[PDB]
């Protein structure tokens, strides 16, 4: 009996298949989150600066109140 | 495709040809050669007649 190297292909490994595809981001939907984070960013920040004004006037009031200084 | 060496034309070949002669399209065809090279290796595994070495 002769024994040589046997042939096997099975699945053929798929000859040239695309793996690159669009994922997560679509296009217009990313701008809704992108610019949406900006509008949420300013509104949250400016409310803190209005709360800073409560401290600001109260800080300068200490100088006016102190005349024996 | 034009000149066979050792059992050619019987194996299916894909040759990538671009449009612009720039470095990027001359790089893309090399990667397109690589994706369309396993087709030959798989067909080499499919066709193997046992005999003389």
Swiss-Prot record, chain A:
It is found in: Mitochondrion inner membrane; Nucleus. It comes from the Eukaryota. The chain crosses the membrane at residues 27-46. Belongs to the complex I NDUFA13 subunit family. Accessory subunit of the mitochondrial membrane respiratory chain NADH dehydrogenase (Complex I), that is believed not to be involved in catalysis. Complex I functions in the transfer of electrons from NADH to the respiratory chain. The immediate electron acceptor for the enzyme is believed to be ubiquinone. Involved in the interferon/all-trans-retinoic acid (IFN/RA) induced cell death. This apoptotic activity is inhibited by interaction with viral IRF1. Prevents the transactivation of STAT3 target genes. Complex I is composed of 45 different subunits. Interacts with CARD15, but not with CARD4. Interacts with STAT3, but not with STAT1, STAT2 and STAT5A. Interacts with OLFM4. This is NADH dehydrogenase [ubiquinone] 1 alpha subcomplex subunit 13. It comes from Bos taurus.
Swiss-Prot record, chain B:
Signal peptide: none annotated. It is found in: Mitochondrion inner membrane. It comes from the Eukaryota. [4Fe-4S] cluster binds at residues 23, 29, 44. Core subunit of respiratory chain NADH dehydrogenase (Complex I) which is composed of 45 different subunits. Component of the iron-sulfur (IP) fragment of the enzyme. Interacts with NDUFAF3. Interacts with NDUFAF7. Interacts with CERS2. Core subunit of the mitochondrial membrane respiratory chain NADH dehydrogenase (Complex I) which catalyzes electron transfer from NADH through the respiratory chain, using ubiquinone as an electron acceptor. Essential for the catalytic activity and assembly of complex I. Redox-sensitive, critical component of the oxygen-sensing pathway in the pulmonary vasculature which plays a key role in acute pulmonary oxygen-sensing and hypoxic pulmonary vasoconstriction. Plays an important role in carotid body sensing of hypoxia. Belongs to the complex I 49 kDa subunit family. This is NADH dehydrogenase [ubiquinone] iron-sulfur protein 2, mitochondrial. The lineage of its organism: Eukaryota, Metazoa, Chordata, Craniata, Vertebrata. The gene is NDUFS2.
């Amino acid at each position: 009996x002769x024994x040589x190297x046997x042939x096997x292909x099975x699945x053929x490994x798929x000859x040239x298949x695309x793996x690159x595809x669009x994922x997560x981001x679509x296009g217009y939907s990313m701008f809704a989150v992108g610019i949406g984070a900006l509008l949420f960013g300013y509104w949250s920040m400016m409310k803190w600066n209005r709360e800073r004004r409560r401290l600001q006037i109260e800080d300068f009031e200490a100088r006016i109140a102190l005349m024996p200084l | 495709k034009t000149q066979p060496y050792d059992v050619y034309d019987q194996v299916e070949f894909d040759v990538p040809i671009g449009s612009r002669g720039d470095c990027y399209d001359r790089y893309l065809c090399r990667v397109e050669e690589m994706r369309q090279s396993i087709r030959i290796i798989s067909q080499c595994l499919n066709k193997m007649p046992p005999g003389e070495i």
